[PDB]
Design a protein around this ligand. Structure first.
Ligand SMILES: CC(=O)N[C@H]1[C@H](O[C@H]2[C@@H](O)[C@@H](CO)O[C@@H](O[C@H]3[C@H](O)[C@@H](O)[C@H](O)O[C@@H]3CO)[C@@H]2O)O[C@H](CO)[C@@H](O)[C@@H]1O[C@@H]1O[C@H](CO)[C@H](O)[C@H](O)[C@H]1O
Length: 394
């Protein structure tokens, strides 16, 4: 018997199809390839560091969730095992764009699992009650956000603890920060647009500045104070659970608007693959399981995933459609995915993220400017690449 270990950070929230129950199906079918999946016991940003100490000690799993934005980091630290020939067998099960983000220099290190396009969640019933529409332009966004804020209702958030992806995603919808020497410019037209829009919203107290993962964010939904936010597609079931029933049958999803010089494009906020790590003695069996696991479309959608698999179209779960006004929100998430700008990540992006969070907390409380978050991103980007002894231009 070949024994495969898979470490994931999928939510496994009550009501979801739990990873262990999906893996149980494979294990009954495949006596000779027995998989143990475990949910990483930590916050998402601690997982790569735990994989790094596991590889050093030799208690690394065969498979591990790795964000596409983490692939360059774990590649450069030598944690990944080349499984190019295994991946080629499964390539035709997966969308080309996310499959390519599991590759470095024409070698493949795993299979893509999901994408994280940004979209816009809103209470459509409350918009109708307030006599507003989803704003088409940045000027309409700011005007309408002031109009709801004047009734104690908020249509935007600025999430200091999600600076890394909310700021890079909204800004990155209109162009890259990083071009590969590395050429670094986090102060693009898109960065300036996002800084300008969020600075107006914060200055006019027309966005909520609660951290995404704090109780204050949840209380903002449940109280009916929060009636619109940019959101990564995978937040859908997490948002519903955070709502505490508030908004049930009233919410909808639409595309990120043309607010940041992005037109009909959106940005990337997470999205992950599963990598084969250094040390796996059974990469063929690991990748055969992984291809199966990542093509269990309905099971993976239940965890909030906008699946990378092309084998079967993703449907909206009944509970999500119940919450979102009967809307097929997954159809919106697929459109958003199709419209998501390419956005190369540098190795060490997570250190950039860490410094952006601290600046963003100051932007929220008014002791910094939102534009300072993108200056932080520039300095930390260049310093991180120099410290990895990489050639940088700025
Ligand atoms: C990109 C990503 O992995 N997103 C995660 C999300 O991760 C952020 C949160 O853990 C917040 C909590 O404060 O921290 C962010 O890390 C900061 C950290 O706060 C700082 O202290 C540190 O110094 O800097 C880092 C940045 O380097 C994390 O980035 O957490 C959520 C909630 O657990 C995850 O859902 C999300 O990952 C997505 O999960 C989906 C399943 O729910 C999918 O698997 C998707 O592909 C993931 O991207």
């Amino acid at each position: 018997v070949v024994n495969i270990t898979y470490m994931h950070r999928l939510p496994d929230s009550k009501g979801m199809t739990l990873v262990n129950d999906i893996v149980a199906k494979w294990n009954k079918e495949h006596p000779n390839i027995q998989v143990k999946a475990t949910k990483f016991d930590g916050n998402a940003s601690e997982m790569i560091k735990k994989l790094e100490t596991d590889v050093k000690a030799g208690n690394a799993p065969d498979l591990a969730q790795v964000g596409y934005a983490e692939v360059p980091e774990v590649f450069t630290k030598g944690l990944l095992q080349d499984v190019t020939d295994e991946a080629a067998k499964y390539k035709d099960d997966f969308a080309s764009a996310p499959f390519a983000l599991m590759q470095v220099d024409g070698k493949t290190y795993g299979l893509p699992q999901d994408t994280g396009p940004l979209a816009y969640f809103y209470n459509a019933a409350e918009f109708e009650k307030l006599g507003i529409t989803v704003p088409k332009t940045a000027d309409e966004l700011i005007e309408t956000a002031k109009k709801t804020a004047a009734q104690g209702k908020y249509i935007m958030t600025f999430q200091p603890d999600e600076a890394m992806m909310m700021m890079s995603g909204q800004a990155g919808a209109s162009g890259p920060w990083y071009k590969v020497s590395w050429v670094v410019n986090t102060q693009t037209k898109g960065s300036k647009a996002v800084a300008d829009v969020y600075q107006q919203l914060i200055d006019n107290k027309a966005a909520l500045t609660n951290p995404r993962w704090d109780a204050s964010f949840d209380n903002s939904i449940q109280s009916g104070q929060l009636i619109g936010t940019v959101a990564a597609a995978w937040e859908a079931p997490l948002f519903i659970d955070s709502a505490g029933g508030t908004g049930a049958g009233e919410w909808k999803v639409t595309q990120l608007g043309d607010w940041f010089g992005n037109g009909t494009k959106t940005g990337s906020d997470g999205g992950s693959g599963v990598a084969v790590l250094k040390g796996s003695k059974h990469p063929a069996e690991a990748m055969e399981f992984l291809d199966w696991f990542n093509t269990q479309v309905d099971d993976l959608v239940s965890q909030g995933l906008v699946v990378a698999a092309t084998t079967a179209d993703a449907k909206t779960p009944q509970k999500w459609s119940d919450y979102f006004s009967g809307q097929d929100v997954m159809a919106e998430f697929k459109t958003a995915n199709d419209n998501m700008g390419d956005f190369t990540y540098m190795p060490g992006f997570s250190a950039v993220g860490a410094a952006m969070k601290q600046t963003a907390a100051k932007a929220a409380d008014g002791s910094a400017k939102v534009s300072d978050v993108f200056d932080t991103a520039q300095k930390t980007s260049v310093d991180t690449l120099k410290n990895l002894g990489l050639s940088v231009k700025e």
